[PDB]
JSON list of C-alpha atoms in Angstrom, two decimals:
[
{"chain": "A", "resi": 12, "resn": "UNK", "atom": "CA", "xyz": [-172.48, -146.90, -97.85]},
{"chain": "A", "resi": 13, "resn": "UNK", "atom": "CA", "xyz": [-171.16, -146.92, -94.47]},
{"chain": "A", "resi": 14, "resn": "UNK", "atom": "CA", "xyz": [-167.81, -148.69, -95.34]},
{"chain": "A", "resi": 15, "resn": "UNK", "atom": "CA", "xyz": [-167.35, -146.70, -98.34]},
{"chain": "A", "resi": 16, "resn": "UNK", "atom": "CA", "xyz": [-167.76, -143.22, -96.56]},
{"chain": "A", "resi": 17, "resn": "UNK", "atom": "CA", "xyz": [-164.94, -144.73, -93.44]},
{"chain": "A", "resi": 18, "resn": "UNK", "atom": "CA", "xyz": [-162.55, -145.17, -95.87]},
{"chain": "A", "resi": 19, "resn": "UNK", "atom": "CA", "xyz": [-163.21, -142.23, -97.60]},
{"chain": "A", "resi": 20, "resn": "UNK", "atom": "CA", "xyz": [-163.21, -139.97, -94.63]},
{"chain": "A", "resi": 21, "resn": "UNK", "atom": "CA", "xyz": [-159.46, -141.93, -93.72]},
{"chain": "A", "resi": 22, "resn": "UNK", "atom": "CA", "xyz": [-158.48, -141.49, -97.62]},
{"chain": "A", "resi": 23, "resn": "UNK", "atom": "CA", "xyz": [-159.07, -137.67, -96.85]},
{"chain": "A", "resi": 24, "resn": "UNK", "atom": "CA", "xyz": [-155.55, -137.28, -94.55]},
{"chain": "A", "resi": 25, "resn": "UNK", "atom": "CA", "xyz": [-152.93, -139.63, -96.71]},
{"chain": "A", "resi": 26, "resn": "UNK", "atom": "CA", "xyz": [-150.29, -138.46, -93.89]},
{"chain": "A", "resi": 27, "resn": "UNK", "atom": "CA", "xyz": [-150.40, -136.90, -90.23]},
{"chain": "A", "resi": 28, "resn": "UNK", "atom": "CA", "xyz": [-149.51, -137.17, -86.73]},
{"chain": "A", "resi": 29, "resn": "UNK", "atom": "CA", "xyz": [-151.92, -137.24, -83.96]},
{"chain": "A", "resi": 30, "resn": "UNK", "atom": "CA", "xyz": [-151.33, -137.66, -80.20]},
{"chain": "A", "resi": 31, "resn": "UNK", "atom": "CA", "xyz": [-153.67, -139.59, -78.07]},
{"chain": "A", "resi": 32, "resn": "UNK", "atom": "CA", "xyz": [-154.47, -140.47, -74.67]},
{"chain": "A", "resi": 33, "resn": "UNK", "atom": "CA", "xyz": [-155.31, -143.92, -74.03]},
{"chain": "A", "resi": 34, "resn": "UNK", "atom": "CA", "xyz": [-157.47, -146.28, -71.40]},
{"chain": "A", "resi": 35, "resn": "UNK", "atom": "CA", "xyz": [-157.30, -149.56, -71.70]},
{"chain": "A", "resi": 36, "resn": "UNK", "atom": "CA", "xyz": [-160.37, -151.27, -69.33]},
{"chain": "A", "resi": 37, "resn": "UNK", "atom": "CA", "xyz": [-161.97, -154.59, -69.18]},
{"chain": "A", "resi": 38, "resn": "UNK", "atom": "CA", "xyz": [-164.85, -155.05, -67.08]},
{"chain": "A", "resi": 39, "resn": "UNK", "atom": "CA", "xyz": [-154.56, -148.38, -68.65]},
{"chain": "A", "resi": 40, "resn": "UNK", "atom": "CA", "xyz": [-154.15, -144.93, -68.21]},
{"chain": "A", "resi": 41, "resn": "UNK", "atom": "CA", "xyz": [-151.58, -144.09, -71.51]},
{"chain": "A", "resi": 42, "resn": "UNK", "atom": "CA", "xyz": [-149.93, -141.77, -73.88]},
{"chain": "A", "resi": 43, "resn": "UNK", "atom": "CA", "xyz": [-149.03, -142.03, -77.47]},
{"chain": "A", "resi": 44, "resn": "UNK", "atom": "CA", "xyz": [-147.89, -140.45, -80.53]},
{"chain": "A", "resi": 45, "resn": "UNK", "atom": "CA", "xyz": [-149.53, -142.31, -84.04]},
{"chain": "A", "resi": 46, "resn": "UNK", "atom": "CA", "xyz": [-147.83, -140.94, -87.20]},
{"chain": "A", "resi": 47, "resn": "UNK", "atom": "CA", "xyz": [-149.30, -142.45, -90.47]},
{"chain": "A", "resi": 48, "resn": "UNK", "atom": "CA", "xyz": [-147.91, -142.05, -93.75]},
{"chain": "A", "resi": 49, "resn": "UNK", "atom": "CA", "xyz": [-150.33, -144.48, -96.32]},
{"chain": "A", "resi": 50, "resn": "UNK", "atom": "CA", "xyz": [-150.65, -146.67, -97.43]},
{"chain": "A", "resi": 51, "resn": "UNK", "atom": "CA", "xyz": [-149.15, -148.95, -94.72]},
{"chain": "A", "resi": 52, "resn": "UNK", "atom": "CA", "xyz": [-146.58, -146.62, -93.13]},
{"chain": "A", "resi": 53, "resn": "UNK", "atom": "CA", "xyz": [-147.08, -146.19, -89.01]},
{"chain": "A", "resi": 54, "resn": "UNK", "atom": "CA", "xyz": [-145.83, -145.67, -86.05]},
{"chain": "A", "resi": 55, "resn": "UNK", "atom": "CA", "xyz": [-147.53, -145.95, -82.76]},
{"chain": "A", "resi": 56, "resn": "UNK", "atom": "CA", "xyz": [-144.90, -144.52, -79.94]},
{"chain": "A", "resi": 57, "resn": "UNK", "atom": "CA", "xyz": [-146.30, -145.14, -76.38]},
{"chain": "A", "resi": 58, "resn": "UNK", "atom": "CA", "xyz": [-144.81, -142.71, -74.18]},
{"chain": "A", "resi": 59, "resn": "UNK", "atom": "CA", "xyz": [-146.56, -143.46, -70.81]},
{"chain": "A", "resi": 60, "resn": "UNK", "atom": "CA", "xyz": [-146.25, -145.12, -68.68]},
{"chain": "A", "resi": 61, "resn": "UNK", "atom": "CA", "xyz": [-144.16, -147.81, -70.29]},
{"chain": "A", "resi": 62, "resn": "UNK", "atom": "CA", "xyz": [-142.45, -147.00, -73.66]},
{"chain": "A", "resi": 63, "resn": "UNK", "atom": "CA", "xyz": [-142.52, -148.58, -76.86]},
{"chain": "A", "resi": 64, "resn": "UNK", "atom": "CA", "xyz": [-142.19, -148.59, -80.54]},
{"chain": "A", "resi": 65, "resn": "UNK", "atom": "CA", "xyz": [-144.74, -150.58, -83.19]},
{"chain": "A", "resi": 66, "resn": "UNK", "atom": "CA", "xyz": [-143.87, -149.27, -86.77]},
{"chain": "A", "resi": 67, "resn": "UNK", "atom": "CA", "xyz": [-144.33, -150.25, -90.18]},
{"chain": "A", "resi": 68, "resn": "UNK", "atom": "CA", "xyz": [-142.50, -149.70, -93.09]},
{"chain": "A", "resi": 69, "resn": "UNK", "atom": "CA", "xyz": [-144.57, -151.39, -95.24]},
{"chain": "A", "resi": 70, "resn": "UNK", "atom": "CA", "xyz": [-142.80, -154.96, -95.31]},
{"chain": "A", "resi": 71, "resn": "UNK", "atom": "CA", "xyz": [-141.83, -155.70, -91.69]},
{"chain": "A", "resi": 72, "resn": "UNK", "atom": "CA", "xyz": [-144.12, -154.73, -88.94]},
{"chain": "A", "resi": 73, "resn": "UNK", "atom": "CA", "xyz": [-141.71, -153.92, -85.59]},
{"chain": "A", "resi": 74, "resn": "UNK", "atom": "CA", "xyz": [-141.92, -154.02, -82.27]},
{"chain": "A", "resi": 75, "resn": "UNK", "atom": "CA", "xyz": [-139.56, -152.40, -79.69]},
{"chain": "A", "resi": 76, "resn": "UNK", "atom": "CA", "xyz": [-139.66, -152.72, -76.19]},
{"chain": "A", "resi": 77, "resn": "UNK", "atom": "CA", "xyz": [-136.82, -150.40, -74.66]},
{"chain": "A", "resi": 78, "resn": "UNK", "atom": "CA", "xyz": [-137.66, -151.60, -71.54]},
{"chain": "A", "resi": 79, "resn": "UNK", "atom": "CA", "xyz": [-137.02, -155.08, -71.88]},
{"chain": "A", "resi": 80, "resn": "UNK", "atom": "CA", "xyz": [-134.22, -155.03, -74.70]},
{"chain": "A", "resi": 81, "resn": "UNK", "atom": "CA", "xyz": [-136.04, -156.97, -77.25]},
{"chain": "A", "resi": 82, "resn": "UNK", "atom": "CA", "xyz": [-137.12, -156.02, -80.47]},
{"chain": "A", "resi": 83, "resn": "UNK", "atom": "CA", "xyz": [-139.62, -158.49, -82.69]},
{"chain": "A", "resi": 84, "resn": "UNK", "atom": "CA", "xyz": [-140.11, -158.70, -86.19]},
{"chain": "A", "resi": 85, "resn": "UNK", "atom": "CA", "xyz": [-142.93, -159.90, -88.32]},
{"chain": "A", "resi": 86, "resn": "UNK", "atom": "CA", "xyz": [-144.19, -159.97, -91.98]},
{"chain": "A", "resi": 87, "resn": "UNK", "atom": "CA", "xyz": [-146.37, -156.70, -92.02]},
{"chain": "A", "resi": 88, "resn": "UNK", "atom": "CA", "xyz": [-148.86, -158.94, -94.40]},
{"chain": "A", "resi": 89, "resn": "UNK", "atom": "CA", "xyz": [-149.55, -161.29, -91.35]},
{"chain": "A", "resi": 90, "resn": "UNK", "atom": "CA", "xyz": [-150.29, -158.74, -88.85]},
{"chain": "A", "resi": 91, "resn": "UNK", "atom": "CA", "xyz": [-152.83, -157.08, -91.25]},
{"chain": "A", "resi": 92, "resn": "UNK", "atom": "CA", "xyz": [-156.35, -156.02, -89.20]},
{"chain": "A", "resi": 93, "resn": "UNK", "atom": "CA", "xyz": [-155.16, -157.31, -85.83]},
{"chain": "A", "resi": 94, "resn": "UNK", "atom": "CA", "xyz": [-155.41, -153.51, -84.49]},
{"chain": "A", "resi": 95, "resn": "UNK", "atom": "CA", "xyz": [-156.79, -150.23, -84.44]},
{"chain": "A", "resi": 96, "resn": "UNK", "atom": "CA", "xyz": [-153.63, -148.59, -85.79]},
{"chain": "A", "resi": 97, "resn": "UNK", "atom": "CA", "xyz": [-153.14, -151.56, -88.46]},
{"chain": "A", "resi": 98, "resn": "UNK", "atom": "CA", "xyz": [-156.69, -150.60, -89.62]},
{"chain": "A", "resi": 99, "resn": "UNK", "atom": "CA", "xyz": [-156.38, -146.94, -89.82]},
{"chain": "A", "resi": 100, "resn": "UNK", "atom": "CA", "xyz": [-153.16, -147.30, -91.33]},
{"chain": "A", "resi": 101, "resn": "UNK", "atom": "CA", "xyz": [-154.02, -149.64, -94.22]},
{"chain": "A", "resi": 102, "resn": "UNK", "atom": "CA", "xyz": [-157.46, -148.62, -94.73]},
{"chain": "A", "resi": 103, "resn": "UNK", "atom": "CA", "xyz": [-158.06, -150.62, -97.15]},
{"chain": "A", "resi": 104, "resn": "UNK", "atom": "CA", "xyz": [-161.78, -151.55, -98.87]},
{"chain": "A", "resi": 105, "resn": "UNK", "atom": "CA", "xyz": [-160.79, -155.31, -98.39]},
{"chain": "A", "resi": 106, "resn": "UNK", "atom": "CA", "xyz": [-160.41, -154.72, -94.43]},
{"chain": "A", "resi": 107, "resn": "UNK", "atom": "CA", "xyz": [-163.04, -153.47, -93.80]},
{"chain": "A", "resi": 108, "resn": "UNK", "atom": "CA", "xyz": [-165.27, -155.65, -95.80]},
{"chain": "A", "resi": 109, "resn": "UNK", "atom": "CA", "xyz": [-164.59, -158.57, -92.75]},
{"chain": "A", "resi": 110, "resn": "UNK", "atom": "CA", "xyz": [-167.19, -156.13, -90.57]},
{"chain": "A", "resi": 111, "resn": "UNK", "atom": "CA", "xyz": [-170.56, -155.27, -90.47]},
{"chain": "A", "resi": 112, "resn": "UNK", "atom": "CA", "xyz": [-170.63, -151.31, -90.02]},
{"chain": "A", "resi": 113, "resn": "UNK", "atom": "CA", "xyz": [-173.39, -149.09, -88.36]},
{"chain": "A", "resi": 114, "resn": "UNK", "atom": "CA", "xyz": [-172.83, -145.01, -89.10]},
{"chain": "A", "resi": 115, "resn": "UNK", "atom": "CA", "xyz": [-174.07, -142.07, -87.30]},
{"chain": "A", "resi": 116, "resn": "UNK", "atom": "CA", "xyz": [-173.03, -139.09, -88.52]},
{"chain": "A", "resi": 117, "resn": "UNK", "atom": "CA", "xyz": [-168.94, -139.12, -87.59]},
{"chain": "A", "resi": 118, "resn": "UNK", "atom": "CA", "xyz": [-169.78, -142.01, -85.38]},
{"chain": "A", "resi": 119, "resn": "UNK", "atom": "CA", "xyz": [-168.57, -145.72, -86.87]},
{"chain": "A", "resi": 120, "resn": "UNK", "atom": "CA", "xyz": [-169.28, -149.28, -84.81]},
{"chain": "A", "resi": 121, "resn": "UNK", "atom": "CA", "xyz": [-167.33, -152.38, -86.32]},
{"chain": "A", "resi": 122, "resn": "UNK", "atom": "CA", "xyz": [-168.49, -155.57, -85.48]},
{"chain": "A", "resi": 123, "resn": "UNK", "atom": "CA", "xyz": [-166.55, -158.56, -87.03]},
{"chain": "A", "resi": 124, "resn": "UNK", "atom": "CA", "xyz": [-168.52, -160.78, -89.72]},
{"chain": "A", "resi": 125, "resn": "UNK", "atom": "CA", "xyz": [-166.81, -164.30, -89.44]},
{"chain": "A", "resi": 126, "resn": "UNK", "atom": "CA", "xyz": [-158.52, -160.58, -84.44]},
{"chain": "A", "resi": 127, "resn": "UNK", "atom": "CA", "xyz": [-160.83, -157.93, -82.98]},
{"chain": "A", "resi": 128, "resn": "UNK", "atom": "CA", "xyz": [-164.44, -158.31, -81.15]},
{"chain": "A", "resi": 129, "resn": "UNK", "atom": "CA", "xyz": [-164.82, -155.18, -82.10]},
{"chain": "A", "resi": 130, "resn": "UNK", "atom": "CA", "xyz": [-163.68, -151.35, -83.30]},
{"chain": "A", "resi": 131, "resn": "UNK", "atom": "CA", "xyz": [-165.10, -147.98, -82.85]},
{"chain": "A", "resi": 132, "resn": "UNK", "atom": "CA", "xyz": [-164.19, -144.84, -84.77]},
{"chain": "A", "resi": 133, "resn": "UNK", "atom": "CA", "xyz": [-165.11, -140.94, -84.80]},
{"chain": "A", "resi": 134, "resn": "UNK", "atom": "CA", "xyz": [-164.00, -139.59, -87.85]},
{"chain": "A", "resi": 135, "resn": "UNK", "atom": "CA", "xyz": [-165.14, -136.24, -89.29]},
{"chain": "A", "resi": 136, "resn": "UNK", "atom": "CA", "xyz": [-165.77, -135.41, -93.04]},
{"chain": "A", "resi": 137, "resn": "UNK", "atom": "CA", "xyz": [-162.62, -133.93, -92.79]},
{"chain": "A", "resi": 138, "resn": "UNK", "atom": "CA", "xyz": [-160.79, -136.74, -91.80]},
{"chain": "A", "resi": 139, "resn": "UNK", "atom": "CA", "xyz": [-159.70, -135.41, -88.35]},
{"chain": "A", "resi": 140, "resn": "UNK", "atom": "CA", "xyz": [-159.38, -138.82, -85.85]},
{"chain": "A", "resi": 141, "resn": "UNK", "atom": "CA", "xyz": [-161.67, -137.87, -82.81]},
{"chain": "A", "resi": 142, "resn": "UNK", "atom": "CA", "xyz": [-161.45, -140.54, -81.15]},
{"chain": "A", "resi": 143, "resn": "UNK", "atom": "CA", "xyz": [-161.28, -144.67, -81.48]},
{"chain": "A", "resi": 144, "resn": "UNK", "atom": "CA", "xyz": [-161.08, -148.01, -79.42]},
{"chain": "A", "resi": 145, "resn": "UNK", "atom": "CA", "xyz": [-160.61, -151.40, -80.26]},
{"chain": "A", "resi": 146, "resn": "UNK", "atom": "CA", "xyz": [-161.80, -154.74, -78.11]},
{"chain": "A", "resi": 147, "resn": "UNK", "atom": "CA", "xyz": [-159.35, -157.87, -78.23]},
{"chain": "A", "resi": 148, "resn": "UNK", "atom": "CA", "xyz": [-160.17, -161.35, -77.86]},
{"chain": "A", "resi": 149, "resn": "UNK", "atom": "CA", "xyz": [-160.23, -161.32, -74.42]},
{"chain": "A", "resi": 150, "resn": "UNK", "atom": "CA", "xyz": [-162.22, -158.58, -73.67]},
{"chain": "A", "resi": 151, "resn": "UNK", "atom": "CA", "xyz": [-159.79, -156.21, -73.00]},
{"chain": "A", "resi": 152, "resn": "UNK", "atom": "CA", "xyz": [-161.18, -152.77, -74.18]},
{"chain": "A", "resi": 153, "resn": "UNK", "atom": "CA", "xyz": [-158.64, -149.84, -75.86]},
{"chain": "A", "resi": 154, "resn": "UNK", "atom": "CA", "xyz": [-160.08, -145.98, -76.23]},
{"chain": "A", "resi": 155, "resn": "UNK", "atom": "CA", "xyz": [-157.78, -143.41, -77.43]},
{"chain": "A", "resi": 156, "resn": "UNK", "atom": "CA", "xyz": [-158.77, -139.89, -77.50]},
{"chain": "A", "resi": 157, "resn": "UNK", "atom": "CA", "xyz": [-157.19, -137.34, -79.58]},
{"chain": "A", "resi": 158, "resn": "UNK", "atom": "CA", "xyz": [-155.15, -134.34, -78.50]},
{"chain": "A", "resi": 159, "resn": "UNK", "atom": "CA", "xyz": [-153.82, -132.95, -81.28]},
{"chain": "A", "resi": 160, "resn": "UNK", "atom": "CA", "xyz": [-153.74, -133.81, -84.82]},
{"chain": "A", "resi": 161, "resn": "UNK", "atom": "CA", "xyz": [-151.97, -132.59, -87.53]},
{"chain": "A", "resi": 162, "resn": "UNK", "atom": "CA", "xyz": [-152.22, -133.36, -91.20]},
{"chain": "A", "resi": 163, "resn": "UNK", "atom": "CA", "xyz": [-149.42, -133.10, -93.82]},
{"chain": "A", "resi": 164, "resn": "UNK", "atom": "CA", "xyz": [-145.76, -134.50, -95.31]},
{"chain": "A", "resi": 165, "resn": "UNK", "atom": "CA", "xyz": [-144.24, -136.75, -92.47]},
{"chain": "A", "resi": 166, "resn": "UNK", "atom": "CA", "xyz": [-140.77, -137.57, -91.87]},
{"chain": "A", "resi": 167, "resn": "UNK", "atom": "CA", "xyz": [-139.84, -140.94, -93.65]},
{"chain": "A", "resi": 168, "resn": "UNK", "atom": "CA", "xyz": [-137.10, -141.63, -90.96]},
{"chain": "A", "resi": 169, "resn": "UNK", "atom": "CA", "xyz": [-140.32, -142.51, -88.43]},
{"chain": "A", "resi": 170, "resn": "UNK", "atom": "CA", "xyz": [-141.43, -145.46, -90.29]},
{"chain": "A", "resi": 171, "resn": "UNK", "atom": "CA", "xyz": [-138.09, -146.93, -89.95]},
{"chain": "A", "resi": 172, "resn": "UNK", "atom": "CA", "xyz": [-136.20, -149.60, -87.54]},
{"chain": "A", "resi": 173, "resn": "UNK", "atom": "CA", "xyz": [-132.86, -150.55, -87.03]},
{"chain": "A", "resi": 174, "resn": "UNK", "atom": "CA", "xyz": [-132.31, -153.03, -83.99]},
{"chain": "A", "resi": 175, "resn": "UNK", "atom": "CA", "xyz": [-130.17, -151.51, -81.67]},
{"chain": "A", "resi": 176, "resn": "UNK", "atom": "CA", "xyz": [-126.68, -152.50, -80.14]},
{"chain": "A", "resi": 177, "resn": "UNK", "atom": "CA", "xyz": [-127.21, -154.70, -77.16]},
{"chain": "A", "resi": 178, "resn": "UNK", "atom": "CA", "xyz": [-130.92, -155.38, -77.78]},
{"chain": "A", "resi": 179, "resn": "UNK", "atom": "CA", "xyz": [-132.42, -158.77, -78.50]},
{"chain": "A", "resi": 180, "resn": "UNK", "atom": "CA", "xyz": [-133.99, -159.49, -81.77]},
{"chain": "A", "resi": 181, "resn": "UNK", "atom": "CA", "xyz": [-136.73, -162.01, -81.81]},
{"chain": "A", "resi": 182, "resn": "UNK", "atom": "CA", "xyz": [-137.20, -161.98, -86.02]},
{"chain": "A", "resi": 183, "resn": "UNK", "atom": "CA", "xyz": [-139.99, -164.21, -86.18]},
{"chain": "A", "resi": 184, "resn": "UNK", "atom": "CA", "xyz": [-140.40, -163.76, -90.69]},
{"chain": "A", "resi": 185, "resn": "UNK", "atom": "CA", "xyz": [-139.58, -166.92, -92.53]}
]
């Protein structure tokens, strides 16, 4: 069915990098990098207007905020389907079974059955990422439009994390 064709159209690309332009609305204005190596390897590098790292290497989900000095870690399992790039990433039958899923053609609609209100997807056959978004809690509304996306062997070292000198670690895994 629908769910079964998403996550075989994501199974078609097991690694890539894609750039994307983002707009986040509600009722903003970005730039990114995503490189995915699966099953849970990511890395979402904002590069405007304010830069920052969220990456995965499979245990520890981290977050670095150059900007700020602080760097926070997490269990990757308790961040699981809390966003877009956690979802793509994983892509796993057993996320997407939380959502009731309407298809049309390379067109998917996510809305939650019982951390997201909802997530959109445009994914072709080919398993090229057109285009996706992602509504929080509070309404606040995430597209991303793809640029350029390129499939094939990434380089381990970007789904890595060391916490640099002089930065502030907030490790928040018991």
């Amino acid at each position: 069915d629908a769910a079964s064709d998403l996550k075989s159209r994501l199974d078609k690309v097991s690694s890539f990098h894609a750039s994307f332009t983002q707009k986040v609305t509600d009722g903003q204005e970005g730039q990114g990098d995503l490189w995915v190596k699966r099953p849970n390897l990511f890395n979402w590098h904002m590069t405007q207007p304010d830069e920052s790292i969220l990456v995965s290497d499979g245990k520890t989900l981290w977050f670095y905020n150059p900007f700020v000095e602080q760097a926070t870690a997490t269990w990757l399992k308790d961040a699981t389907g809390n966003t877009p790039f956690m979802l793509i990433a994983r892509n796993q039958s057993s996320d997407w079974q939380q959502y009731n899923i309407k298809q049309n053609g390379d067109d998917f609609v996510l809305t939650p059955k019982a951390n997201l209100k909802q997530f959109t997807i445009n994914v072709g056959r080919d398993g090229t990422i057109h285009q996706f978004s992602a509504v929080e809690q509070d309404d606040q509304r995430s597209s991303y439009q793809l640029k350029s996306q390129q499939n094939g062997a990434v380089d381990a070292a970007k789904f890595t994390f060391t916490p640099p000198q002089g930065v502030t670690v907030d490790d928040q895994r018991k």
